[PDB]
Design a protein around this ligand. Structure first.
Ligand SMILES: CN1CC[C@H](c2c(O)cc(O)c3c(=O)cc(-c4ccccc4Cl)oc23)[C@H](O)C1
Ligand SMILES: CN1CC[C@H](c2c(O)cc(O)c3c(=O)cc(-c4ccccc4Cl)oc23)[C@H](O)C1
Ligand SMILES: *Cc1c(COP(=O)(O)O)cnc(C)c1O
Ligand SMILES: *Cc1c(COP(=O)(O)O)cnc(C)c1O
Lengths: 830, 830
């Protein structure tokens, strides 16, 4: 059937009875009233059973051996579905496929019932998920810590061509994967005030909110390692949240508990955008405060909570603990670690600071200013009074270091301060992170260089040793084996299975680039994937597409910097050219654009409307026929990505040079047989460098060109004046050609393009359409298109998150990865 | 060990492995980190497994045979713990005891970990629970329908002698007994308006709230029948509760979902008191609206949803459905049934009314005015516009019936109206219930008579056939076998086990009233129970009591009508007499008073303080020694009742004659070997009648005496003037003898007693203390005290809820009870 594992005789039999056990005893149903959802659940519980044994021994193992622990703090974990991924990592896929088949059920049908765990916005959250998978596969004692939102990223609906948001009630039917651990609930404090008494400061009169943990297992790839992802949920205490007496109403008090519990209610749906709301700050401290208590508790046990030098010497803390800050969201971990060490453990400031810096590391994800977290001092002042004091003290000591290093450089002083003066004083969380971390890394070579040359230039000059680079990656399990079994199979047929946990081995495929059989196969799986997607499209969304056309797709969050607008200009250009010479042959294309817009991002929502507006015109023009279709992919999310990416021919990665720190969707398309048209931005640079620029479709300005244009001054009118095709498009938009009933509907888009385009869409237009013409030429030559595809696939090995994690491990955490199988799962009950 | 079932070799072995299965796979724990709570859960899941098989076949059975279904609607189900009760009804207690013993665990220790399901205030909620147990034991196709409150009755804490309330987060660690059934979620409507169009009225522009059901199994006593209790939970839809667009904030919209969900958040903590709050009305409609949809859906299937006369003829509705309204709380079921039949099914009014009346029956629980539900018309007008219209129409037609029956009786017309004029117009829910039900019953003979003679005299004259009586009862399983195994054993030793489901057989014990062995035994188990309680007291609450004294207990909700105050007067009298003649012998007593006060009931809270204030003085007077202790039993609830009742010697049932409709605590004490001191009120009358007044300690005014006093006019001063002992007590309270630091602390109590005592505490004082002297005399004669106890126990058979349910079944529902064992639980998987 494929290499989804063995369908053993004893195990298929064992699976079936357990499926039946759960359907009866767990779901309390009988075959005569069970629905597909019930069957999905019976299966999930059956699969979940297989890793608890391993989960228990893995955690017991770490307790015995006591290795250095890695704590990955993130406010986002974009997990997606977990049934298939679990089967894959446990080598259960075929056995399960067989067992459900014999029970008369279609496993694929049941998998579609699982709800996505959408606890993330996009790239940042998905990276955390890929990292968790790699850390387990590399046998690291790692823990993912976050927040268990009861409502994840909103489900996107398109009404009248506009995006409608609706709550993502992903827990509605329950989550079979998590395990509530109410016995490990921890208290988190808010508000209050600081008392300075005799021997130290005291944080007093605080409001208490409880943090209840929920654990989800993270299985490594076929190595019997099962790590833990601990997500915190907010709960109101039953006392004060009722006991603070003297009238108000007993009923009201109880109803008001959903005020403390709102902290973990919903994920902020902003991608690369900072919104300074109090609720967000509460969420950030909540995850940090609870996590750190858990980390220290575990440490106090270790082998120090037995003997060792005897005397809680936190001198060894950094030798046993590593905390990775995914962006600045969990930045309060730095002043919180100090607070605990100084205020509670009573360590001297300098010793505490030494420990803090040595255990914390920070990962920067973007350079755009509106993504930068700058919290108003009055907010921190009211909510976290002691932390503000600690931050001022950290700032004080840091600036003294700067002054000593650059005597008289007064402007440098204000530039590096963690405190920004002005309208309202604010705290720069990025500066906080750099000062309190021993390592700061960018997510792609170009991005890391930009950090040193621009945004954090002063900090790099002060401590060059802190700055590093760790190019992002994606997990080959979910992003190849899981979503593209067909491709994984033909690759395995030639080079074996060892590449699944050693992607570099994909290079061996280079020697099949002229193999007639392989070329035919690679091309066949892509055709099958396209036919499958084309069917899914009519199944769940309904309105046909041609599977013989070039599948041109751009899927990612809607952003001005991502330039979905540039894509739109090209689509309209294609349309206008066909209308000019109807009977001229052009390579048929199905351009698919999908992605969610943050609810308050007006321009992003306007772009979605433009996309659907273009499709309304183009898709119903008889003269165009099936040569051009414009489709907006609704509710783009992890599970949808697993469907479109394997079906794509052309991957659109066209952000303005210097704006996309790295990107990861780009890597997903490369691994799945799509060719890339993009700018020299983020990881694109490293991808072209790995495959050879001749096997990549690069166009547009480079970072330097953008800077040159800025010195000069960007004037869109110029491009409008010199390019007739461009002029024609802008006039079509302006006149209502794409919005008959509301002729001025797109005035904001046009106005922006012409007068305030921070991302110079027009500047890359000419080179973009020219490059697109080259893609079409090559597509007309199936054999050569496929050969270039093989060159990309064979050279994508570097982009596996296993490589990324191995680098973090060695160059930042100080731990050694290992591909050693944990001593089987075997029963055991001590 | 006792007759808690057989500890079979194969089953104890089977139990142990399943306990281990659950500890490993379900709880994901290993013996090295498992805590008593984990062990309790492993056991609960193991026991829960044993009834799913039966649960499934019972429900399948009803589907095949299609008997008339009984729907018991109640806003309260005071269930308590369910582990032990399940073991008892499944005959698993000994096997489980053995198995956990071999696993090295103390089953009794684990049982204490289970949280009470306190979804009720007291009597009314506990009655619903006893009824569910009896209906299952009598093989009735019955369903209990209610609301799944996430917060039940508050946990009571005594601080400084005052009651403090704190949220009852009973779901904190999860509920192993329930099964969420999200697939059966139903929508409930609120607000909106009524459109009268061509062919009928339409309820439009409503706000939708979803009702998600949770099912809990209700096992019958050893007959393999497992019925269902379906509790509804409120959930906000994901659309409109987000989709009603045009600014406000996406985040806010999501947070605002906890506005629709507040409906099932908390139980109103009022016992026999009406609070006209909108949230309460919403709860009442919520349970009614969801339940009725479920009832009709099931009906449409039956055997009509196959063939029969073919044509949804609701003519057979009353032949297949019976809806019992537990008090007026679910009264909206009447106009809701009409709404559905008329507005949706399009039946003519008269046919719909015929069906409604024939399927509905109402149970009245009290005659006190402040418990009467009178909803303001403006509230129903805004929240349920169509129901108000239907109620006016029902009223209209009903009054026309009255006018035709009593021509010219204009005052009768206004008296019987469902609409009350005055300050604000209100709807009398009790009148609604009588008009739309074919049966109305009181809960004890005297209460039922009072209803016909007073409160509902006009209605009784109109339709005498509607009025009935159904004396309350308690289940002998939980209230004897479960809480008093020792007593159940010695009884079984002489007459067998058949009495557990046939309490009348207890009469056979009369022939052992002179048996020397039995007398010694009955007395021994009572002594063991007392020693056990006396230990529990120091264990969990700490401060010693003497197990050799007479255990004088009054446990029930704190009320002015229940007269805990009268008890207080007696206690103070005892104290004053000892202080007067210290060296005179008196029978030692431990008087225990426990019960919760509604949070807003000031007087009730003042009484609790008085009780603790008396104990402060009495318990620390050296001269008193161990002859008199006054203890306030904290957090009285079902699980605590299971502990004190079996340990009691004297049961205090002293409400003012005519105020306690029935009472059930009184029956619990009679069954467990306590003698009763009480007034001729509620069921007390029937209890004395069953045991013989010579074996009961009756005192005080009868209903007639109370009425006589009212004609005359009650003047407390008179009693104050003629009874020195009483005068001395009132002056002690007035002067601060019991509240040194706050001398006027009890001025409200004294003022009330002297000027506005609606319950004439003083009028029964003399006869009360005189009667108490008779109890002490008899206690001094162990042998005779015990012989009187045997006369009470042997004659309590009539008070089993099996008898009550058998009467409801035959005289109201039209179904025949059956003690036939359902065809085993045996595996099966169709
Ligand atoms: C001037 N104004 C433009 C819109 C912007 C804004 C909003 O008002 C609301 C939003 O939800 C977003 C968002 O999600 C991303 C970005 C963003 C992110 C990176 C680069 C450029 C931009 Cl415009 O901007 C947002 C902010 O008010 C400043
Ligand atoms: C005059 N006033 C007295 C208090 C009463 C009241 C409250 O203000 C608040 C409450 O929670 C209760 C309660 O639980 C029971 C009874 C009650 C019930 C039956 C008979 C007599 C009484 Cl007093 O009364 C309550 C109401 O405001 C009328
Ligand atoms: C991989 C992924 C992303 C990130 O895509 P980029 O193109 O790097 O912005 C966003 N959303 C989902 C659903 C993803 O799978
Ligand atoms: C039985 C019971 C009641 C009812 O007691 P009465 O004395 O009839 O008022 C109230 N609360 C609990 C916990 C009960 O078990």
């Amino acid at each position: 059937i494929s290499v989804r594992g063995l369908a053993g005789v004893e195990n298929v039999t064992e699976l079936k009875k357990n499926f039946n056990r759960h359907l009866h005893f767990t779901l309390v149903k009988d075959r005569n009233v069970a629905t597909p959802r019930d069957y999905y659940f019976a299966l999930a519980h059956t699969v979940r059973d297989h890793l608890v044994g391993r989960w228990i021994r893995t955690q017991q193992h770490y307790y015995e051996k006591d290795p250095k622990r890695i704590y990955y703090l993130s406010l986002e974990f974009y997990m997606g579905r977990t049934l298939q991924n679990t089967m894959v990592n446990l080598a259960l896929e075929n056995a399960c496929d067989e067992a459900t088949y014999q029970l008369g059920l279609d496993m694929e049908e049941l998998e579609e019932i699982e709800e996505d765990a959408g606890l993330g916005n996009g790239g940042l959250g998905r990276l955390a998920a890929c990292f968790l998978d790699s850390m387990a596969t590399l046998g690291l004692a790692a823990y993912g810590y976050g927040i268990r939102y009861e409502f994840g990223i909103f489900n996107q609906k398109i009404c009248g061509g506009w995006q409608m948001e609706e709550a993502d009630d992903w827990l509605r039917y329950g989550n079979p994967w998590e395990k509530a651990r109410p016995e490990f609930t921890l208290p988190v404090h808010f508000y209050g005030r600081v008392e300075h008494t005799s021997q130290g400061a005291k944080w007093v009169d605080t409001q208490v909110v409880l943090a209840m943990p929920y654990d989800t297992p993270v299985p490594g790839y076929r190595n019997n390692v099962v790590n833990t992802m601990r997500l915190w949920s907010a709960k109101a205490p039953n006392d004060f949240n009722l006991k603070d007496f003297n009238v108000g109403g007993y009923i009201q008090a109880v109803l008001d508990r959903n005020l403390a519990e709102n902290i973990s209610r919903v994920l902020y749906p902003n991608d690369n955008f900072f919104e300074g709301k109090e609720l967000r700050l509460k969420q950030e401290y909540f995850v940090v405060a609870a996590t750190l208590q858990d980390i220290i508790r575990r440490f106090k046990s270790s082998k120090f909570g037995c003997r060792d030098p005897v005397r809680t010497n936190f001198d060894a803390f950094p030798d046993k603990v590593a905390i990775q800050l995914n962006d600045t969201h969990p930045s309060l971990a730095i002043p919180e670690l100090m607070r605990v060490l100084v205020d509670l453990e009573r360590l001297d400031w300098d010793k505490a600071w030494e420990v803090t810096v040595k255990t914390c590391a920070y990962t920067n994800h973007t350079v755009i200013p509106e993504a930068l977290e700058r919290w108003p001092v009055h907010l921190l002042e009211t909510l976290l009074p002691r932390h503000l004091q600690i931050i001022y003290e950290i700032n004080q000591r840091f600036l003294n270091r700067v002054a000593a290093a650059f005597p008289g450089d007064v402007d440098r002083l204000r530039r590096m301060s963690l405190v920004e003066e002005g309208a309202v004083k604010r705290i720069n969380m990025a500066h906080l992170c750099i000062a309190g971390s021993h390592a700061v890394n960018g997510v792609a070579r170009i991005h890391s260089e930009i950090l040193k040359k621009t945004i954090f230039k002063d900090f790099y000059e002060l401590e060059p040793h802190k700055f590093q680079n760790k190019t992002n990656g994606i997990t080959p399990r979910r992003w190849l084996v899981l979503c593209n079994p067909g491709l994984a199979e033909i690759i395995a047929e030639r080079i074996g299975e060892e590449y699944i946990s050693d992607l570099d081995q994909l290079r061996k495929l280079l020697s099949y680039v002229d193999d007639e059989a392989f070329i035919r196969d690679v091309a066949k799986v892509k055709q099958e994937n396209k036919l499958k997607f084309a069917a899914y499209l009519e199944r769940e969304y309904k309105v046909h597409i041609n599977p013989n056309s070039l599948f041109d797709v751009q899927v990612k969050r809607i952003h001005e910097y991502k330039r979905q607008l540039l894509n739109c200009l090209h689509v309209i250009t294609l349309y206008n050219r066909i209308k000019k010479e109807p009977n001229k042959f052009v390579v048929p294309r199905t351009v698919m654009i999908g992605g969610k817009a943050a609810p308050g991002y007006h321009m992003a929502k306007m772009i979605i409307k433009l996309i659907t507006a273009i499709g309304d015109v183009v898709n119903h023009d008889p003269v165009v026929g099936d040569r051009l279709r414009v489709i907006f992919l609704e509710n783009y999310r992890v599970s949808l990505a697993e469907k479109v990416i394997p079906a794509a021919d052309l991957s659109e990665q066209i952000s303005t040079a210097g704006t996309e720190a790295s990107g990861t969707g780009n890597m997903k398309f490369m691994l799945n047989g799509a060719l890339t048209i993009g700018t020299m931005d983020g990881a694109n640079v490293e991808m072209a460098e790995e495959a050879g620029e001749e096997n990549f479709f690069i166009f547009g300005m480079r970072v330097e060109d953008v800077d040159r244009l800025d010195q000069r001054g960007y004037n869109a009118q110029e491009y409008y004046d010199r390019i007739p095709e461009l002029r024609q498009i802008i006039e079509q938009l302006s006149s209502g050609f794409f919005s008959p009933k509301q002729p001025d509907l797109f005035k904001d888009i046009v106005n922006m393009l012409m007068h305030h385009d921070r991302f110079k869409v027009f500047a890359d237009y000419e080179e973009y359409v020219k490059c697109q013409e080259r893609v079409s030429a090559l597509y007309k030559n199936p054999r050569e298109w496929t050969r270039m595809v093989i060159r990309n696939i064979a050279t994508s090995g570097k982009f596996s998150s296993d490589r990324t994690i191995a680098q973090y491990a060695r160059e930042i955490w100080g731990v050694e990865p290992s591909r050693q199988r944990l001593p089987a799962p075997d029963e055991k009950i001590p």
